[PDB]
Design a protein around this motif. Structure first.
Motif, mmCIF file in Angstrom:
data_model
loop_
_atom_site.group_PDB
_atom_site.id
_atom_site.type_symbol
_atom_site.label_atom_id
_atom_site.label_comp_id
_atom_site.label_asym_id
_atom_site.label_seq_id
_atom_site.Cartn_x
_atom_site.Cartn_y
_atom_site.Cartn_z
ATOM 1 N N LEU D 209 0.805 -1.223 0.000
ATOM 2 C CA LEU D 209 0.000 0.000 0.000
ATOM 3 C C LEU D 209 0.835 1.270 0.000
ATOM 4 N N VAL D 210 0.248 2.356 -0.476
ATOM 5 C CA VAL D 210 0.986 3.569 -0.784
ATOM 6 C C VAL D 210 0.119 4.803 -0.557
ATOM 7 N N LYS D 211 0.730 5.936 -0.234
ATOM 8 C CA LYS D 211 -0.050 7.121 0.085
ATOM 9 C C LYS D 211 0.182 8.253 -0.912
ATOM 10 N N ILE D 212 -0.842 8.608 -1.690
ATOM 11 C CA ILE D 212 -0.680 9.643 -2.719
ATOM 12 C C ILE D 212 -1.315 10.968 -2.362
ATOM 13 N N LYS D 213 -0.677 12.051 -2.778
ATOM 14 C CA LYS D 213 -1.282 13.365 -2.611
ATOM 15 C C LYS D 213 -0.753 14.307 -3.676
ATOM 16 N N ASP D 214 -1.204 15.553 -3.682
ATOM 17 C CA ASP D 214 -0.690 16.515 -4.650
ATOM 18 C C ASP D 214 0.672 17.011 -4.223
ATOM 19 N N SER D 215 1.537 17.277 -5.195
ATOM 20 C CA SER D 215 2.903 17.672 -4.891
ATOM 21 C C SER D 215 2.966 18.970 -4.126
ATOM 22 N N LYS D 216 3.725 18.932 -3.044
ATOM 23 C CA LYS D 216 3.864 20.075 -2.178
ATOM 24 C C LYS D 216 5.082 20.864 -2.593
ATOM 25 N N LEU D 217 5.749 20.390 -3.637
ATOM 26 C CA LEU D 217 6.854 21.137 -4.209
ATOM 27 C C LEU D 217 6.354 22.498 -4.650
ATOM 28 N N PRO D 218 7.133 23.543 -4.362
ATOM 29 C CA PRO D 218 6.790 24.945 -4.617
ATOM 30 C C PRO D 218 6.363 25.231 -6.051
ATOM 31 N N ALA D 219 7.056 24.647 -7.023
ATOM 32 C CA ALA D 219 6.792 24.930 -8.431
ATOM 33 C C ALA D 219 5.358 24.597 -8.827
ATOM 34 N N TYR D 220 4.811 23.573 -8.190
ATOM 35 C CA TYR D 220 3.497 23.049 -8.534
ATOM 36 C C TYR D 220 2.364 23.559 -7.646
ATOM 37 N N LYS D 221 2.672 24.505 -6.764
ATOM 38 C CA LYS D 221 1.794 24.870 -5.649
ATOM 39 C C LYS D 221 0.317 25.093 -5.982
ATOM 40 N N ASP D 222 0.033 25.928 -6.971
ATOM 41 C CA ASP D 222 -1.343 26.351 -7.208
ATOM 42 C C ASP D 222 -2.091 25.525 -8.243
ATOM 43 N N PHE D 223 -1.473 24.444 -8.693
ATOM 44 C CA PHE D 223 -2.010 23.616 -9.767
ATOM 45 C C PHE D 223 -3.434 23.096 -9.524
ATOM 46 N N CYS D 224 -3.872 23.147 -8.269
ATOM 47 C CA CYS D 224 -5.154 22.583 -7.836
ATOM 48 C C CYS D 224 -6.423 23.147 -8.497
ATOM 49 N N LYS D 225 -6.372 24.377 -9.000
ATOM 50 C CA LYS D 225 -7.589 25.076 -9.430
ATOM 51 C C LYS D 225 -8.345 24.364 -10.548
ATOM 52 N N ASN D 226 -7.631 23.556 -11.317
ATOM 53 C CA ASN D 226 -8.208 22.874 -12.463
ATOM 54 C C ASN D 226 -8.706 21.480 -12.110
ATOM 55 N N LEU D 227 -8.699 21.169 -10.821
ATOM 56 C CA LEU D 227 -8.927 19.810 -10.356
ATOM 57 C C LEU D 227 -10.272 19.675 -9.661
ATOM 58 N N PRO D 228 -10.826 18.457 -9.648
ATOM 59 C CA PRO D 228 -12.181 18.172 -9.172
ATOM 60 C C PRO D 228 -12.277 18.344 -7.672
ATOM 61 N N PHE D 229 -12.601 19.542 -7.202
ATOM 62 C CA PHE D 229 -12.287 19.859 -5.822
ATOM 63 C C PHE D 229 -13.377 20.286 -4.828
ATOM 64 N N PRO D 230 -14.106 19.338 -4.236
ATOM 65 C CA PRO D 230 -13.677 18.886 -2.908
ATOM 66 C C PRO D 230 -12.794 17.668 -3.164
ATOM 67 N N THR D 231 -13.313 16.865 -4.107
ATOM 68 C CA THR D 231 -12.792 15.608 -4.669
ATOM 69 C C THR D 231 -13.634 15.267 -5.896
ATOM 70 N N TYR D 232 -13.402 14.096 -6.474
ATOM 71 C CA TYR D 232 -14.188 13.654 -7.620
ATOM 72 C C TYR D 232 -15.438 12.903 -7.190
ATOM 73 N N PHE D 233 -16.555 13.197 -7.844
ATOM 74 C CA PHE D 233 -17.823 12.556 -7.521
ATOM 75 C C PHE D 233 -18.475 11.956 -8.747
ATOM 76 N N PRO D 234 -18.261 10.656 -8.981
ATOM 77 C CA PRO D 234 -18.836 9.984 -10.150
ATOM 78 C C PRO D 234 -20.360 10.116 -10.220
ATOM 79 N N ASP D 235 -20.997 10.358 -9.080
ATOM 80 C CA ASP D 235 -22.432 10.619 -9.043
ATOM 81 C C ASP D 235 -22.860 11.895 -9.764
#
Ligand code: MG
Ligand code: MG
Ligand code: MG
Ligand code: MG
Ligand code: MG
Ligand code: MG
Ligand code: MG
Ligand code: MG
Ligand code: MG
Ligand code: MG
Ligand code: MG
Ligand code: MG
Ligand code: MG
Ligand code: MG
Ligand code: MG
Ligand code: MG
Ligand code: MG
Ligand code: MG
Ligand code: MG
Ligand code: MG
Ligand code: MG
Ligand code: ZN
Ligand code: ZN
Lengths: 38, 177, 38, 261, 162, 97
Positions: D209-235
């Motif tokens: 098992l493995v733990k994934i998240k968004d990169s906390k590296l500075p270069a990628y910081k604000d990349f989140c805006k284009n993402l399904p956010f709270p999370t993804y909802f197939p419903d």
RNA sequence: CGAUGUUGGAUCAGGACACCCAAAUGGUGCAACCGCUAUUAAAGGUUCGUUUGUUCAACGAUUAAAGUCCUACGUGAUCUGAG
RNA sequence: CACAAACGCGUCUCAGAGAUAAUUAAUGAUUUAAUCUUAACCUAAUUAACUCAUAAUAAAUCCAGCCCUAGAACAGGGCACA
């Protein structure tokens, strides 16, 4: 700049100033006269 | 004077909670009296093998003051133990980082160097500003007098006091300020 | 042991140091400073 | 809630499958790690003031395991939830606008292709190891008359110091321990089986098992805006996603079969 | 106290001096024969950095010292007063004697470290990393030696270094 | 008088000084006059005239200076010091011109 | 002296700064590129070979550079033994 | 490379903010000019360290047996599908 134990003016244009807790000799005409007391 | 044995003895050796305001005080002078109360050297019943020592609550620690240039000159050194782990820090930096540190280290320095030092350090309570858990507030018996008299600034003086102090010299009307 | 005379200034026996410290010159101090007098 | 600039999403817990080659339209070859999300649910929610005093903490479960071999406490915990027990459980720091409700499913589509993630796991345990494998010391030469020394650490300290310093590199346990890979690009997403194709190598043995998240590296910081956010909802969308989502630099399994010109 | 005013009207600029009212020396000094302003009020060896009511009388609204020939201080006492004023500034007394700058009040810095009796300027002082043992010890200056003649009621001389 | 020479007075048109010799307050304005009238400042530009207006009754000393910015700088020395007039003159008439 | 085993290598290096490289600057008989000096800075670096037992040293090829030293001339209950 | 692995000669990844020393400046007194100031007040420009965001860890107590990419022992992960 030269760090020296004794400061002395090398011409009439040198002036003598106390900065950062030290004495200095600044000269506008000849920059080569700059001195910082150690 | 007439008490049963048990309550008598309980009364005598009772712990007491002192409050100490730290605003504009030298950490040293604070730590002096803090030390005395911590060891219980203010109690005529004092002995080294009696547990007697009292709680001290120091507050406004952030607002502590340092005579002379000590803020700049005084350094606190520590060593992590790993090679290249030697750390020197100017008091200004230490205080900027951890508001409680300065006064704590002073008190820790002035206690006797035996094992009890570790225990009577547990009866010390340090608060950066005045916010105290109500729990600890409800224990306070009394407040010690601040060891340094704090000089008032110029704007603190009433106009009465300002006019009561003599003009020493008379400026020429021509001169400009 | 060092010679009586030496280059490096020769630390004194402590008692002699006390003796020296006791016998220092003390300048006379006027009751009122002559400058703040009329 | 809508997306604020300094915000941070929940992560996932996946299963390392194996590795696969993949090609890019420029002709270069990359190797990817397949991470499959199996059963992923948020478990509990610790508010901001109760945890770090800074960010809220979501707790996320990994793949399903047997009831019988867990502990009474834990079984109670899942009982009051209504999920079956999860093997691995991790904690994610989350800005309070990103919070979800415990008992909510998480899927692979939570990451979109082209992005950067961080992957954390226990590294492959190599057990008690010598000084050469663990640290990378040279040994002493093999042949020129060395006696019984060909691997040993050599001198471990100075003569005067008279002790050996606390940092000192010495034989010892190697590898079962947690590390994080940073700055990994995600290339492809398989929505049917819930598989993330990440770039390069991810610490852990396959099937761990493995733990994934968004990169906390500075270069990628604000990349989140284009993402399904709270999370993804197939419903919610009521429109299915394609079988696979690709980055625009990726040669697909069927395609023109690239010709330079 | 003489203000200088400047006005801009239609490409003509007018600069003019204007005299305001100056407060006067208090009517009855204790030692009228006394030469220097400090001394005829019997303040010699008495005022400290702490006494603001005295110090604010020689300085400028912007916080700098007044020149000596204007004030009339005995040279020695001028130097003393100057020291005290520096110390008092640094101590956070006379907050109203700074220059006013509408922009710079907004950008907060780490809250002012409370200090007092500081001889040097904060920016000029190297941290002493090496301390040193009992026999050679680096001592930290406190207050100024110009004041070492203040009257001591305890009888023990003021401690100028720790 | 030296600080005016370094500063290139050529930006000035006409400089007049109106003062009243028998008044007690006119020393400042006079000092200004002798600082502008010196050979250095006077020879920096020949297109500029320096006029001394001397009256007994006027009772208010004054300095008026026109320059080619279309600017008119009038400073009334009464309670003003000489080098305050000269510093004002410098920063005013140099920065603009 | 009822033993504190000694040169140079190997291995691992701990530290100083009196800085060889990397950083920030002052002066130049500093136009530019190079340099020569001086200040501040010790987190990280500081090559591979031919001959010598060698440390030095010479030489070949490079390097951003191939620092000066202290640690029982660091380190033989870890190695080497050419001297 | 004759174990399903280990491994390099192979592949992947590697970072924000604050802080300073020397040295440059702006405003400005003691010394009504000047003057970067062991004068104040705000200030700017500025090495490396070094702190710090941030990341990692983070469910108290079923554990006989058996399995394991977990392990010297002890521990640790699995054992309802199928
Ligand atoms: Mg003898
Ligand atoms: Mg293993
Ligand atoms: Mg080998
Ligand atoms: Mg042998
Ligand atoms: Mg043998
Ligand atoms: Mg062998
Ligand atoms: Mg030791
Ligand atoms: Mg012997
Ligand atoms: Mg023996
Ligand atoms: Mg080393
Ligand atoms: Mg140096
Ligand atoms: Mg360099
Ligand atoms: Mg080094
Ligand atoms: Mg030797
Ligand atoms: Mg040796
Ligand atoms: Mg040897
Ligand atoms: Mg040994
Ligand atoms: Mg000025
Ligand atoms: Mg200038
Ligand atoms: Mg941290
Ligand atoms: Mg188990
Ligand atoms: Zn000169
Ligand atoms: Zn006097």
């Amino acid at each position: 700049f030269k760090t020296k134990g004794v400061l002395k003016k090398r011409c009439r244009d040198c002036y003598l100033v106390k900065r950062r807790g030290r004495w200095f000799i600044y000269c506008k005409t000849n920059p080569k006269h700059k001195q910082r007391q150690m | 004077s007439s008490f049963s044995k048990a309550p008598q003895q309980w009364a005598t050796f009772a712990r007491v909670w002192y409050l100490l305001d730290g605003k504009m005080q030298p950490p040293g002078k604070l730590a002096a009296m803090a030390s005395v109360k911590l060891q219980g050297l203010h109690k005529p019943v004092y002995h080294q093998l009696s547990d007697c020592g009292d709680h001290v609550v120091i507050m406004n620690t952030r607002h502590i003051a340092f005579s002379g240039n000590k803020w700049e000159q005084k350094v606190y050194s520590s060593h992590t133990g790993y090679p290249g782990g030697f750390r020197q820090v100017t008091a200004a930096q230490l205080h900027q980082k951890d508001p409680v540190a300065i006064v704590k280290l002073a008190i820790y320095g002035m206690l006797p160097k035996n094992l009890h030092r570790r225990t009577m350090m547990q009866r010390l309570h340090l608060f950066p500003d005045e916010d105290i858990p109500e729990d600890i507030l409800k224990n306070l018996v009394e407040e010690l007098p601040q060891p340094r008299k704090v000089p008032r600034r110029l704007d603190e003086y009433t106009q009465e006091e300002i006019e009561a102090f003599p003009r020493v010299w008379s400026p020429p009307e021509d001169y400009r300020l | 042991g060092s010679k009586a005379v030496t280059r490096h200034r020769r630390v004194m026996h402590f008692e002699r140091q006390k003796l020296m410290a006791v016998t220092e010159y003390i300048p006379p101090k006027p009751t009122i400073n002559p400058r703040c007098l009329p | 809630h809508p997306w604020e600039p300094g915000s941070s999403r929940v992560g996932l817990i996946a299963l390392k499958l194996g590795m696969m080659p993949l090609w890019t339209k420029d002709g270069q070859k990359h190797v990817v790690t397949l991470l499959q999300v199996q059963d992923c649910h948020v478990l509990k929610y610790t508010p901001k003031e109760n945890h770090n005093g800074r960010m809220a903490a979501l707790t996320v479960g990994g793949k399903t395991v047997s009831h019988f071999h867990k502990s009474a406490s834990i079984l109670e915990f899942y009982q009051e939830l209504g999920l079956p027990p999860k093997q691995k459980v991790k904690i994610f720091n989350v800005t309070e606008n990103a919070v979800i409700k415990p008992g909510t499913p998480l899927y692979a589509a939570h990451f979109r292709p082209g992005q950067y993630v961080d992957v954390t796991a226990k590294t492959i345990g190599k057990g008690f190891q010598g000084v050469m494998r663990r640290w990378g010391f040279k040994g002493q030469p093999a042949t020129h008359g060395q006696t019984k020394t060909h691997r040993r650490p050599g001198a471990i300290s100075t003569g005067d110091v008279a002790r050996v310093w606390p940092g000192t590199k010495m034989p010892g346990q190697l590898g079962n321990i947690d590390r994080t890979a940073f700055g990994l690009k995600v290339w492809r997403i398989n929505t049917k089986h819930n598989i993330i194709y990440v770039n390069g190598s991810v610490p852990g043995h396959k099937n761990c098992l493995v733990k994934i998240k968004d990169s906390k590296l500075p270069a990628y910081k604000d990349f989140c805006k284009n993402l399904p956010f709270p999370t993804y909802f197939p419903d919610g969308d009521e429109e299915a996603l394609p079988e696979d989502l690709y980055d625009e630099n990726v040669c697909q399994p069927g395609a023109p079969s690239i010709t330079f010109t | 106290f003489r203000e200088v005013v400047e006005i801009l009207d239609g490409k003509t600029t007018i600069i003019e001096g204007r005299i305001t009212e100056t407060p006067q020396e208090s009517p009855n000094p204790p030692n009228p024969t006394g030469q220097c302003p400090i001394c005829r009020w019997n303040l010699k060896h008495k005022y400290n950095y702490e006494d603001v009511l005295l110090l604010s009388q020689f300085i400028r609204p912007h916080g700098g010292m007044l020149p000596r020939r204007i004030t009339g201080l005995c040279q020695e006492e001028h130097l003393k007063i100057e020291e005290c004023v520096k110390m008092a500034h640094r101590a956070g007394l006379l907050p109203n004697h700074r220059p006013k700058l509408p922009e710079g009040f907004v950008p907060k810095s780490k809250p002012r470290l409370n200090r007092y009796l500081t001889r040097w300027s904060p920016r000029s002082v190297k941290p002493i990393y090496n301390k040193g043992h009992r026999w050679n010890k680096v001592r930290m200056p406190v207050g100024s030696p110009l004041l070492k003649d203040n009257v001591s009621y305890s009888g023990r001389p003021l401690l100028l270094y720790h | 008088a030296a600080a005016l020479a370094r500063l290139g007075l050529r930006a000035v048109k006409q400089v007049r000084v109106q003062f009243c010799p028998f008044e007690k307050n006119v020393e400042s304005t006079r000092t200004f006059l002798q600082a502008v009238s010196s050979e250095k400042v006077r020879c920096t530009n020949l297109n500029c005239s320096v006029i001394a207006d001397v009256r007994h009754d006027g009772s208010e000393p004054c300095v008026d200076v026109l320059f080619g910015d279309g600017h008119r700088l009038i400073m009334r020395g009464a309670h003003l010091t000489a080098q305050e007039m000269l510093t004002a003159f410098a920063s005013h008439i140099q920065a603009r011109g």
